Ligand binder design. Structure first.
Ligand SMILES: *[C@@H]1O[C@H](CO)[C@@H](O)[C@H](O)[C@H]1NC(C)=O
Ligand SMILES: *[C@@H]1O[C@H](CO)[C@@H](O)[C@H](O)[C@H]1NC(C)=O
Ligand SMILES: *[C@@H]1O[C@H](CO)[C@@H](O)[C@H](O)[C@H]1NC(C)=O
Ligand SMILES: *[C@@H]1O[C@H](CO)[C@@H](O)[C@H](O)[C@H]1NC(C)=O
Ligand SMILES: *[C@@H]1O[C@H](CO)[C@@H](O)[C@H](O)[C@H]1NC(C)=O
Ligand SMILES: *[C@@H]1O[C@H](CO)[C@@H](O)[C@H](O)[C@H]1NC(C)=O
Ligand SMILES: *[C@@H]1O[C@H](CO)[C@@H](O)[C@H](O)[C@H]1NC(C)=O
Ligand SMILES: *[C@H]1O[C@H](CO)[C@@H](O)[C@H](O)[C@H]1NC(C)=O
Ligand SMILES: [Cl-]
Lengths: 372, 372
């Protein structure tokens, strides 16, 4: 019967022929076609293009190949420079661009044909302030990776203007993974309260060296921006008396979700976990499908870059996506109509107890922090 | 061989513009007007216009440029997103990119390097502003930013200071600065740093003037580079301390003529509004033409240089681009914007920023900032 084609663009990966995003994308499409309640009369297909990491110019060409081929939406790529290149094209030809990773969304930008499933970093930052105020911290030190800007932490940087807070900003070496020089500076200055803005991979390695420097003790309290905090191995640390706190957006307490995480299972990091980066791609294919069910008449057109005019179904389809609602792996999903960003969402608060990383509360933008 | 052709991308408007198109013409005629024995190929500047700061439009523009056989690509001066696209494609084809405007992508150090930049680096501006603050004995200061990107431009400054009401606060515009300025006054902070475009800076200063915060107790530092063409009528006083920067060497032999020309161009389009003075970007465009011609001729003295058509669809490069990059970094030129030299990374060095101070009628130079 009927067929609707998505296109996905994925970076090449050292790991193997297929990265986490691409595997989750396919995993999601298969599940939805096997499902009868969701898209009963539609069968999802797709075209995949791959590009080298950091190759924004190749991302343009591949995006244009897909639009020329005919697609209803484009998922990926992950790296910001390429994501921006594709976003620009998708806006020009009026085909929806579905993003799953965070990227710096420039201010003066006026692209409107895209949506992002990553939790807005300003909301995440407000949740981190709420932790800071709750713990009654007067002084804190923010450590960020050169890779990501200061920009996404802007809510944190503005805080000392409104609250009695003293904030010291420290940057992680860009040339290396070793951070002992930085840890030494902090230890020296009695910087016991710390916020780490970095991936969970980099966090695992940073706690390792922090342990080799007697900084994993009852004196130090660490807050992490990574949502994949739970997927860390905290065996070495769970008796040192150190406090660790962070957030989780994977709704793992929900049994329907846990079973899917299980199928998916078939350095410092554990195994048998679905990363948030992969869960978000899986939820993107679903939330877009909810929009396709409310628009059964659309048909992809072969659009050519710098020649044709916007897809005649684009504007409608993009509206429906921004209005879509879906209960997914990462809890309830809803976009902000004003900017296509995911500024409203639910978090669980996780913290290091003697038994391991456990839940100790929740958070959402409307009612603030809710420790239990 | 046949001629030094270079392309320039202009995001400048034709009516009441910054004079970029005319500045390019002036340099081209000045250089071609000098006859030499032996004679040398004529200089040509092919001009391409950019309607919007679009990566999508810019990629198309680069694709029209590559077949023309050019030696460099200049600009754009005020489209950060487009400028990084030009840098990337230039890197791929190994045609030098002469930067004359803000670019606020990293870019990653380990990508292809095909650039020099006549525009001050973010670090340079942050250092200059720090040095002025040091001159005041590091007062309590508040930063007022138009958009969040100021944490990127002034990254070096912000992370050097402790962030708090007593040291350095950060505030951003939503768009009425009166709320911010009152919060700053309630903190009893005397020194304010304004990072915005000329018109927004003018707006912050006008609202401060209304609140009486424009007396001699306050010191403002504007990071805008069009500080000399920013005219504060009925805002500045005898008491006022409003500091800013300028790159112009008014003792340059061609400066007076350069201003007369841009003055008349401005009248024959905008008889309604009065001429503000030369925009920094026009001057940089002029200097850029001299820098490129200088490097190419030095290269042609020890190699035979040839250019051929390139294409976006071809893996071909310009074989001589890599040598021209060496000769571009070795350039030592005396232009409208001061001394132009470059370091191993393509950043401008051994130059100065004149530190000006507004007065009721004109400016006063109260010192300079160096790099060496
Ligand atoms: C099928 O789709 C429905 C409706 O979207 C969804 O709620 C449900 O989880 C899916 N059922 C299964 C078992 O695939
Ligand atoms: C949309 O985002 C803006 C700020 O990014 C926020 O003020 C507004 O409340 C958001 N709307 C929704 C529906 O969350
Ligand atoms: C360089 O090569 C010769 C002189 O060396 C001359 O014919 C040619 O015009 C020169 N090209 C340029 C652009 O200087
Ligand atoms: C300055 O920036 C503001 C946004 O903060 C924008 O609205 C305004 O148009 C800009 N001014 C000019 C003339 O570029
Ligand atoms: C522009 O030219 C006229 C010529 O007399 C002069 O009065 C005016 O001062 C000039 N503007 C500037 C800023 O130099
Ligand atoms: C300005 O021009 C004069 C004359 O050309 C020159 O002597 C001086 O070095 C220039 N100023 C700077 C700082 O480059
Ligand atoms: C820097 O520029 C000045 C001219 O303004 C020049 O005299 C001086 O030698 C330069 N320094 C170096 C080491 O290049
Ligand atoms: C606070 O926490 C509980 C447990 O997560 C949650 O059920 C409740 O809705 C939260 N309060 C509100 C109104 O958000
Ligand atoms: Cl404290």
């Amino acid at each position: 019967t009927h067929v609707l084609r998505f296109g996905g663009i994925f970076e090449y990966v050292e790991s193997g022929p297929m990265g986490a995003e691409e595997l989750a994308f396919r995993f999601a499409v298969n599940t939805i076609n096997r499902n009868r309640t969701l898209l009963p009369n539609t069968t999802l297909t797709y075209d995949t293009q791959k590009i080298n990491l950091y190759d924004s110019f190749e991302a343009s060409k591949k995006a244009c190949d897909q639009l020329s081929l005919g697609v209803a939406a484009i998922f990926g790529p992950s790296h910001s420079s390429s994501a921006n290149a594709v976003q620009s094209i998708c806006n020009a030809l009026g085909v929806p661009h579905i993003q799953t990773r965070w990227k710096h969304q420039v201010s003066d930008n006026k692209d409107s044909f895209y949506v992002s499933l990553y939790p807005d970093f300003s909301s995440l930052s407000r949740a981190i302030l709420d932790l800071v105020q709750f713990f009654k911290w007067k002084t804190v030190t923010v450590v960020y990776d050169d890779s990501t800007g200061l920009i996404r932490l802007q809510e944190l940087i503005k805080a000392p203007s409104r609250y009695n807070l003293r904030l010291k900003i420290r940057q992680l070496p860009a040339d290396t993974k070793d951070a002992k020089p930085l840890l030494k500076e902090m230890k020296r200055g009695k910087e016991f309260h710390v916020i780490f803005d970095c991936s969970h991979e980099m966090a695992a390695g940073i706690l390792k060296q922090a342990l080799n420097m007697s900084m994993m003790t009852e004196y130090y309290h660490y807050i992490f921006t990574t949502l994949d905090l739970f997927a860390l191995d905290v065996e070495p640390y769970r008796y040192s008396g150190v406090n660790m706190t962070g957030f989780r957006i994977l709704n793992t307490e929900n049994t329907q979700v846990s079973s899917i995480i299980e199928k998916w299972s078939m350095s410092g990091l554990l195994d048998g976990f679905m990363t948030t980066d992969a869960a978000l791609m899986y939820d993107a294919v679903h939330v877009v499908s909810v929009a396709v069910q409310q628009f059964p008449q659309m048909t992809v057109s072969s659009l050519q870059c710098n020649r044709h005019k916007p897809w005649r179904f684009g504007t409608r389809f993009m509206s429906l996506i921004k209005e879509a609602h879906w209960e997914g792996l990462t809890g309830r999903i809803t976009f902000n109509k004003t900017n296509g960003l995911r500024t409203d969402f639910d978090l669980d608060v996780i913290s290091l107890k003697e038994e391991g990383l456990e839940k100790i509360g929740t958070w959402d933008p409307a009612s603030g922090l809710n420790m239990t | 061989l046949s001629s030094l052709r270079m392309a320039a991308i202009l995001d400048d408007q034709t009516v009441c513009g910054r004079g970029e198109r005319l500045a390019l013409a002036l340099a081209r005629e000045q250089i071609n007007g000098i006859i030499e024995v032996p004679a040398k190929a004529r200089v040509e500047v092919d001009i391409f216009e950019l309607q919007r700061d679009s990566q999508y439009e810019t990629t198309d523009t680069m694709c029209q440029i590559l077949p023309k056989g050019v030696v460099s690509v200049l600009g754009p001066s005020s489209s950060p997103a487009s400028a990084s696209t030009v840098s990337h494609i230039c890197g791929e084809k190994e045609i030098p990119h002469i930067k004359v405007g803000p670019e606020e992508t990293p870019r990653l150090q380990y990508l292809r390097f095909a650039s020099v930049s006549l525009y001050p680096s973010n670090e340079d501006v942050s250092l200059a502003v720090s040095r002025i603050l040091k001159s005041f004995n590091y007062p309590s200061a508040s930063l007022i930013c138009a958009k969040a990107e100021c944490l990127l431009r002034l990254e070096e400054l912000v992370r050097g200071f402790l962030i708090s009401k007593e040291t350095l606060s950060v505030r951003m515009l939503d768009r009425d600065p009166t709320p911010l300025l009152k919060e700053i006054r309630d903190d009893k902070v005397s020194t304010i740093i304004i990072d915005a475009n000329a018109s927004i800076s003018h707006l912050v200063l006008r609202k401060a003037s209304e609140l009486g915060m424009t007396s001699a107790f306050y010191k403002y530092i504007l990071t805008t580079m069009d500080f000399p063409i920013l005219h504060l009528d009925g805002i500045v006083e005898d008491s006022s301390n409003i500091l800013g920067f300028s790159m112009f060497n008014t003792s340059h032999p061609f400066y007076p003529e350069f201003v007369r020309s841009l003055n008349m161009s401005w009248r024959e389009n905008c008889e309604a509004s009065t001429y503000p003075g030369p925009a920094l970007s026009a001057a940089l465009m002029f200097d850029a033409v001299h820098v490129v011609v200088s490097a190419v001729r030095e290269l042609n003295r020890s190699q035979e240089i040839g250019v051929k058509p390139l294409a976006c669809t071809s893996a071909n490069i310009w074989p001589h681009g890599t040598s021209l990059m060496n000769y571009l970094r070795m350039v030592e030129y005396d232009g409208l914007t001061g001394r132009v030299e470059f370091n191993s990374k393509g950043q401008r060095t051994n130059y100065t920023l004149r530190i000006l101070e507004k007065s009721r009628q004109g400016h006063r130079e109260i010192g300079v900032w160096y790099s060496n």
